[PDB]
Amino acid sequence: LKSILEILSKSPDSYQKILLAICEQAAETNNVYKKHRILKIYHLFVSLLLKDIKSGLGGAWAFVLRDVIYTLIHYINQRPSCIMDVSLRSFSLCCDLLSQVCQTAVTYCKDALENHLHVIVGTLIPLVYEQVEVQKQVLDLLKYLVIDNKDNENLYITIKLLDPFPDHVVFKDLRITQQKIKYSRGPFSLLEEINHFLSVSVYDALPLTRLEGLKDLRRQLELHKDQMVDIMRASQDNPQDGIMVKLVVNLLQLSKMAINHTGEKEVLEAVGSCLGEVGPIDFSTIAIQHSKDASYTKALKLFEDKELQWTFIMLTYLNNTLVEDCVKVRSAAVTCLKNILATKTGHSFWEIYKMTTDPMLAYLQPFRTSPLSENHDIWIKTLTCAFLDSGGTKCEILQLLKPMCEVKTDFCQTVLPYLIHDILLQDTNESWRNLLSTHVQGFFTSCLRHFSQTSRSTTPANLDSESEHFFRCCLDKKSQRTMLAVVDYMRRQKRPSSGTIFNDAFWLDLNYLEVAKVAQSCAAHFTALLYAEIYADKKSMDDQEKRSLAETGISLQDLLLEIYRSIGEPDSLYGCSYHESLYNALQSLRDREFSTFYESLKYARVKEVEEMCKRSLESVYSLYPTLSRLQAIGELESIGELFSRSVTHRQLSEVYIKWQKHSQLLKDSDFSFQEPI
């Protein structure tokens, strides 16, 4: 019987059509009425039930997928109005899974025809006005260019046939520069002369390329991990001598100089994955040692302003909805989607639908949609002993903090939907787990007034002591202690007092060494100085109280001096294997006619990759040594050409003119900047 549904399923298709048309198309009519979102969730679960054997039943799986695609294409009228984002997410997931699982000598024609059907849909597109995520998925699909076959490249060209369409020039003028810069590879006919013409037209209609180039870099930053852009950007901008001149002119600004910082962040992204060329990608920036006056990193996600339109915890409701939207990967997240579908409780009709129509995300996210038992809280305060015992002193922080999640699932009966979502969400990863833990624990323990004075004043101190007493974790105790940020920012709402120090006294246990030593171990100067000043003020207040009534506090000045020494500022220090590298560099550069210049360049690349790996958190100063090393790499590249081709007329004179220009650019520097130079 299954063979007919597998292979002979051509007449059964019209048979099922006649079945659903027996009642005057009532089946598909009710499916459209119910938005068929539950049906698409069921289809996603069926697709997840797959992936057992790649071959064999893979043909039947592809047949079922093509039948679902056909039934989806059969009606295009109200599908874009009903649901597009979920379908785009499913298509992106299936396409990336295909690209990651496909290998040599596989039956690729089935997925090729599936991609052909997807492209046919994208070309039909009755609502031609496409959004930004469609172009994002297109750019992510166009990344596969190296190991593709000739037929695959022809199919990719047929896909790119959507580019020369001159309608709705907005997204074209936005992302054609990115589409062109994604062609950094060399062996090809470039296959997109029309896209290069479009890029040239975009760059020429606006006769300016310097600052809009950095603006295009900002527009590229919001893309995915793999970019392969910075090399070509540097090779195009560095020869332009006006960039550095206009930067020196505009040095009178105050901010917006984190281009290199964002590049380093993008390099730190996707380190454990493949494509380790991000090092050489970042090393192309030889126009450096001019972005200064930037102490450390800054904030992001400016959507917090629109987030603070609701006065109450509905801001945290919006944050939870954003997290739920972000959890969209694979299995154990379709359960999260079902939980989202289950969020239509009484609160959805009472308070959720107040201001969920004005913001941008609310234009497409919520319109798809639309009281439990009570216990006591004494056994949990009793089990806090074993909760503290299972605090730290063990590796595997994931299953070490999972008991913390099991303890926090104990519902503090103040707000229902928070506890409901905490109980329903038992499949997310450790990051979301720790975020929800911090948020829920903080808010509900601040709501608790009778049990916070006893448990929330002793258990956290014991936890900090056990975590600090020579038994720590692999950097995850920092994310654990990030609860202090919520304590200092969000938790200070209730218990209104004119004193933030008084709020911290009400909330925390008021330790003096279980936090300072943790900050010293984390090497984060922000919270270090914050808690240093807070504890100094608290010690002053305690001394005043003792005088009114009438380690060891005094030695903390030594720890403060150590902190000041760990910062690296001139007013804070005292105001209060490179030998072998040079040897091998000289050995590689001790012969004029020597082909080991590429070997020396590779050695320098490996050394700079090691330096980048050693430079963690991208917050310490003294990147200028590596900047001068990049300058030296460029100088060696120039010397490799000078030693070989100096014939016609004094090209070394022009090289020396360039050196004088570079020295004039580097006039805004000091000892620690020029001594390596």
Binding site: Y15, Q16, N30, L39, V68
Partner: protein, 65 residues
């Protein structure tokens, strides 16, 4: 009841799969069996009409099969 609900879903799926008319005798037998099962409990059509979620699940299972 707890098993008749799944039994009713399975019977609806089987009737939808066997309501074909290619094979004369087998098709007539399957149609007679489906007609006899609908009036067996005498509330099967009303239950299937009221169970929108069950009908959607049966449609999804038929599409996946």
């Amino acid at each position: 009841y707890k098993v008749l609900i799944p039994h009713l879903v399975i019977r609806s799926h089987f009737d939808e799969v066997k309501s074909i008319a290619n094979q004369i005798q087998e098709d007539w037998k399957s149609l007679l069996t489906d007609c006899f099962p609908k009036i067996l409990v005498n509330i099967l059509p009303y239950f299937a009409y009221e169970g929108t979620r069950d009908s959607g699940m049966a449609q999804q299972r038929e599409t996946a099969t």
